[PDB]
Amino acid sequence: ESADLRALAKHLYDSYIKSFPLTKAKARAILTGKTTDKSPFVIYDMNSLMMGEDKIKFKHITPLQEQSKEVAIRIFQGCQFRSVEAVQEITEYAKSIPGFVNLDLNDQVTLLKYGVHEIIYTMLASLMNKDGVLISEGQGFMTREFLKSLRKPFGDFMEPKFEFAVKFNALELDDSDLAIFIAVIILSGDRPGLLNVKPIEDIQDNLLQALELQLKLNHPESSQLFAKLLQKMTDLRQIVTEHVQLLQVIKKTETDMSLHPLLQEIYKDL
């Protein structure tokens, strides 16, 4: 049984490389300054943001800068745009996981709907230092302090993401580990409204074995790593909860904020 589980881990890691353009390996290389490439443009303040504002990939009728008078809104829009693309990359990876295609589509939609936010925050940690986050596919770096400067409620918007990333990065997971971990999160059988729970948990049980084999082999000296990682899964639930509350406060609080239809689908009835 050991040989079949190892093949699954390989399958997932290959799909992961195919699906996700900026990997942890690449992100860490950039963050550690070990790269042929020139260092990212650092946005730490309003002036740096203005010069680097053009670098941000916001695609719309008007340029990012003209989009709002208020800078926290423009950053918010950039995050939402990246999230829409992130959901596409996750969905593509979800289709790669064995048996996911066979399940009921409505189940497949339910799993993505709850899964995506938790996966995004996992992979965001790959982009994160204690001091900031790589943005725009590595081309820029926005500091944690600058994100924390923005007026309320936006100032506290990214901070739990940073707090989670410090703890999660301390696990020192590599890309191969993450591929399986992510697969496990997608295949959670306790999502509200799932029609057929049994096939889901069946796959998730298989994924969980591959994961702990992966972690023993890849991280032999790390005692109870599997345990620590499962506990994180529960932490992610709690980040998303926090995040949704904040969106509602924005919803009623800000008239200007506009939500993409894809996000809007995931957010409704959550």
Binding site: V87, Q88, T91, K95, L105, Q108, V109, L112, K113, P261, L262, E265, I266
Partner: peptide, 11 residues
């Protein structure tokens, strides 16, 4: 029409 469903039935 779910947009997620549309993404799922994509190639």
């Amino acid at each position: 029409p779910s947009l997620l469903k549309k993404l799922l039935l994509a190639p």
